[PDB]
Amino acid sequence: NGYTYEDYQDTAKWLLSHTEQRPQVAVICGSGLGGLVNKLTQAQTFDYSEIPNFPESGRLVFGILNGRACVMMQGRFHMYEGYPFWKVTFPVRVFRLLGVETLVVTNAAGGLNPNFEVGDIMLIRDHINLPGFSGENPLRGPNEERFGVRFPAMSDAYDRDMRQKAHSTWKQMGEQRELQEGTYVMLGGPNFETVAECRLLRNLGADAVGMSTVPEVIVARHCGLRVFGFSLITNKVIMDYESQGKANHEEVLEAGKQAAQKLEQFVSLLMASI
Amino acid sequence: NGYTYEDYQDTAKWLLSHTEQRPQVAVICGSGLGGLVNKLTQAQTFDYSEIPNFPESGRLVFGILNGRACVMMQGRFHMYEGYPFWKVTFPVRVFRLLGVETLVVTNAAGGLNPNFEVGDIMLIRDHINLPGFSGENPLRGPNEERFGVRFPAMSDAYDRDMRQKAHSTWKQMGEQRELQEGTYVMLGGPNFETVAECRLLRNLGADAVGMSTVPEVIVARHCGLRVFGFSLITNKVIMDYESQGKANHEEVLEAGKQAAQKLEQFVSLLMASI
Amino acid sequence: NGYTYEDYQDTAKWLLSHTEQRPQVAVICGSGLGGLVNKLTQAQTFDYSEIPNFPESGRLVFGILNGRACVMMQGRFHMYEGYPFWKVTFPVRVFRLLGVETLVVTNAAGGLNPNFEVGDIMLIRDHINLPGFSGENPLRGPNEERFGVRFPAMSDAYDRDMRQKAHSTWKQMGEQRELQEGTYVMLGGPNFETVAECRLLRNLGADAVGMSTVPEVIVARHCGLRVFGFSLITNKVIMDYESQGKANHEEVLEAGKQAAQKLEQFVSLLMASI
Ligand SMILES: Nc1nc2c(ncn2[C@@H]2O[C@H](CO)[C@H]3O[C@@H](CP(=O)(O)O)O[C@H]32)c(=O)[nH]1
Numbered sequence: 072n073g074y075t076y077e078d079y080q081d082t083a084k085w086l087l088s089h090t091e092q093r094p095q096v097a098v099i100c101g102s103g104l105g106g107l108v109n110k111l112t113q114a115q116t117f118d119y120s121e122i123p124n125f126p127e128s129g130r131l132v133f134g135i136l137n138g139r140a141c142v143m144m145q146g147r148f149h150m151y152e153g154y155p156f157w158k159v160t161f162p163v164r165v166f167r168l169l170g171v172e173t174l175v176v177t178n179a180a181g182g183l184n185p186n187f188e189v190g191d192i193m194l195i196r197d198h199i200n201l202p203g204f205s206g207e208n209p210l211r212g213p214n215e216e217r218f219g220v221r222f223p224a225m226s227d228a229y230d231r232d233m234r235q236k237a238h239s240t241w242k243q244m245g246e247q248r249e250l251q252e253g254t255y256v257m258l259g260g261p262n263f264e265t266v267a268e269c270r271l272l273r274n275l276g277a278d279a280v281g282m283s284t285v286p287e288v289i290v291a292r293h294c295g296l297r298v299f300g301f302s303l304i305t306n307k308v309i310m311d312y313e314s315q316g317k318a319n320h321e322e323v324l325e326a327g328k329q330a331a332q333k334l335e336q337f338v339s340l341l342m343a344s345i
Numbered sequence: 346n347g348y349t350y351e352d353y354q355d356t357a358k359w360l361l362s363h364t365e366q367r368p369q370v371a372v373i374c375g376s377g378l379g380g381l382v383n384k385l386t387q388a389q390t391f392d393y394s395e396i397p398n399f400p401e402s403g404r405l406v407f408g409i410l411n412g413r414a415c416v417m418m419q420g421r422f423h424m425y426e427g428y429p430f431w432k433v434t435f436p437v438r439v440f441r442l443l444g445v446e447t448l449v450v451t452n453a454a455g456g457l458n459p460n461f462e463v464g465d466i467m468l469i470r471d472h473i474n475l476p477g478f479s480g481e482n483p484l485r486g487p488n489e490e491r492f493g494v495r496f497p498a499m500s501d502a503y504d505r506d507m508r509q510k511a512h513s514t515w516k517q518m519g520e521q522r523e524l525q526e527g528t529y530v531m532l533g534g535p536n537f538e539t540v541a542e543c544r545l546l547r548n549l550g551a552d553a554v555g556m557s558t559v560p561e562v563i564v565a566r567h568c569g570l571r572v573f574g575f576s577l578i579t580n581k582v583i584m585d586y587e588s589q590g591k592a593n594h595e596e597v598l599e600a601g602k603q604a605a606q607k608l609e610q611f612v613s614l615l616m617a618s619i
Numbered sequence: 620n621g622y623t624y625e626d627y628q629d630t631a632k633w634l635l636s637h638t639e640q641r642p643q644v645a646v647i648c649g650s651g652l653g654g655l656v657n658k659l660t661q662a663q664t665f666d667y668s669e670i671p672n673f674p675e676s677g678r679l680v681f682g683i684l685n686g687r688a689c690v691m692m693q694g695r696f697h698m699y700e701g702y703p704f705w706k707v708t709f710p711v712r713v714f715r716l717l718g719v720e721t722l723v724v725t726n727a728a729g730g731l732n733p734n735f736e737v738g739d740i741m742l743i744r745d746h747i748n749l750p751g752f753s754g755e756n757p758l759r760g761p762n763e764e765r766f767g768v769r770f771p772a773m774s775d776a777y778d779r780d781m782r783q784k785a786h787s788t789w790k791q792m793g794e795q796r797e798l799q800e801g802t803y804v805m806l807g808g809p810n811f812e813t814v815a816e817c818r819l820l821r822n823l824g825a826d827a828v829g830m831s832t833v834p835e836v837i838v839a840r841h842c843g844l845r846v847f848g849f850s851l852i853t854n855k856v857i858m859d860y861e862s863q864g865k866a867n868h869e870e871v872l873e874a875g876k877q878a879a880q881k882l883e884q885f886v887s888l889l890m891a892s893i
Pocket residue numbers: 100101102147177178179180181182258260263264280281282283284305306308318319320323324770
């Protein structure tokens with residue numbers, strides 16, 4: 072970890088003096104889900120480049136969403152960009168110092184569960200942190216008690232209540248396709264998985280595969296934030312050597328557009344119940 | 346590896362000139378098992394801070410245990426503290442240069458095998474080194490032949506004889522609960538595993554999960570030491586989403602106390618047969 | 620990645636001005652397969668030490684093989700030597716800048732599939748990149764579009780045509796033992812796997828285990844090279860605690876000799892069909 076506690080304080084102090092907004096909820100927008108910030112009222116935006124200590128991208132937007140004061144990350148950071156996890160998760164700790172209590176994380180992922188279909192929304196019930204198995208963890212290094220404990224529990228990371236409410240809200244939305252729910256596995260990237268890797272991951276019990284999120288959740292749980300999140304299934308991963316095609320970022324961004332209005336609508340409603 | 350061969354020599358030379366003790370056996374005490382050093386006779390202690398080149402913590406204690414000359418590490422180092430494995434395992438190589446022939450490793454672990462119960466003692470028959478799958482290995486870097494070979498075998502790491510004797514000794518102890526035996530899997534930490542991760546690990550064939558030991562064993566085998574070890578089962582990991590509770594370091598330390606007298610007693614007897 | 624684009628250019632320019640050879644095919648020789656370079660005609664060799672920017676070993680040999688212009692790496696680099704993957708794979712990108720279109724990779728591996736026998740040749744149909752699960756990837760860091768895309772597909776890494784031709788060619792060779800085909804899994808090393816690790820890997824769907832290759836393939840696919848490869852099964856890994864013996868580098872090198880003439884013969888013929 073290359074940031075001191077004071078670094079975190081300085082950055083939060085800077086934000087508090089540049090906007091009157093006082094967020095209670097923070098949202099990290101995954102790839103293609105950035106349009107969510109366009110629904111905020113009384114909004115104020117800061118490019119990451121203008122914020123002291125912020126990792127290099129990228130906009131941070133404050134505002135009101137369906138009655139709730141929020142702060143959203145339009146664009147996030149990734150391990151595959153070369154950033155260590157202490158940089159990838161720097162914003163989560165700043166949010167805590169701002170007074171945020173709940174964190175919503177979203178991402179684009181590849182579907183491992185055969186029952187999934189492109190466009191599906193999968194609530195995240197649990198995760199598998201592969202980089203963590205080898206020590207790549209945002210918490211690696213001396214522990215800072217002002218944030219949390221040395222050995223944080225992670226079995227209850229994704230708030231159960233929020234998931235119930237989430238299912239309730241989706242009911243009131245009157246959607247034809249059911250709201251999915253499963254386990255998200257994170258791996259480094261940036262390349263897409265081979266057939267052997269996809270089969271393996273599925274056998275490990277994962278329902279969706281991605282390249283982010285997990286480190287943010289771990290840090291959020293460590294400092295005390297309530298966590299909720301979901302994945303937009305952007306493609307069904309190739310499970311056999313009879314590959315009619317192969318994963319590509321184009322289709323991932325395409326799928327991101329088709330389900331924009333939908334995803335944005337869902338998150339907007341969930342604010343009500345927090 | 347940031348230590349030269351001379352660094353290892355200098356440190357061993359320093360220890361040999363500050364104590365008359367000449368250990369044949371070395372013991373690394375895991376969390377909560379530190380009371381073991383209190384049974385040594387003609388003991389001499391050195392805080393790690395007073396020993397040149399030693400990683401920063403932490404006491405090294407020399408003495409006689411049930412007739413055998415020993416040197417024990419009261420407190421060990423971990424990857425989750427930010428230390429690279431070449432630092433975590435520095436003492437093992439120093440021990441070899443001191444004349445030590447056998448290494449006993451102990452640790453606190455979470456139980457994956459359903460038949461295990463808190464308090465159980467599980468002899469370590471084999472291990473799974475997850476960090477090693479990605480290259481995080483104390484042997485990474487140019488090989489130093491003065492210590493061992495470039496490609497060391499690890500399938501016979503845990504001495505079979507010692508395990509037989511271990512079972513024999515436990516018999517003479519007249520314990521009601523049987524002595525367990527299984528596979529130990531090491532992951533980075535510092536957070537506790539999620540339900541998905543626990544299920545996965547069990548399916549990989551692991552019986553107990555921890556955050557240390559494996560790197561020490563690998564280095565000990567590389568330089569020629571005989572190895573024996575075991576885990577104190579401090580908690581039964583949550584295997585379902587009907588979690589009545591969740592892992593916590595408090596209970597781990599609590600369990601460490603209840604089985605202190607027992608664990609300490611067992612190790613004391615095992616010295617006889619080496 | 621510690622090499623700039625210009626570094627790659629400078630090195631390729633140097634090679635182009637020191638030899639009249641213009642390779643279309645590149646071959647990376649694994650351990651014990653180095654004798655392959657002895658069949659090249661009109662050959663020219665450069666020790667890696669004489670080539671600007673080349674990682675420290677090691678010879679690069681240009682020449683004609685059964686009618687095809689080739690460049691071969693007699694000796695490769697490994698993660699267990701302490702080299703980051705951007706160093707291990709530096710040559711692959713230089714080859715691309717030289718005008719190479721196809722890459723052949725070979726290695727020595729341990730057999731996981733029970734049907735395999737020492738000496739068997741296993742064509743590589745797919746792979747499992749364990750280090751990649753944690754982020755150790757030659758592509759980690761800012762993407763260089765002059766080489767390839769940010770998110771490269773890997774499900775079609777091993778050219779299907781080449782595999783068909785490979786099987787065809789092996790037919791014309793009239794060999795008694797069939798040509799094997801399976802999945803190669805790469806782990807860091809340098810130690811050999813324990814029994815628990817071997818069982819685990821097999822259950823993940825791997826047929827052979829090694830310490831190289833995968834990173835080279837990923838980089839070759841990223842910059843557009845056609846890829847073909849195979850493993851020489853140098854030993855049957857210990858799958859039970861009734862180990863009659865244990866893996867050793869001696870036997871691996873021994874097996875490498877016995878199948879030299881065979882392996883060398885096979886590769887020589889495959890050139891014809893490219
Ligand atoms: N590991 C993996 N990641 C995928 C796949 N499909 C989508 N992704 C995610 O979207 C991008 C590639 O199109 C990657 O970058 C990030 C985007 P995120 O910030 O997680 O929304 O995770 C990966 C996929 O199939 N596998």
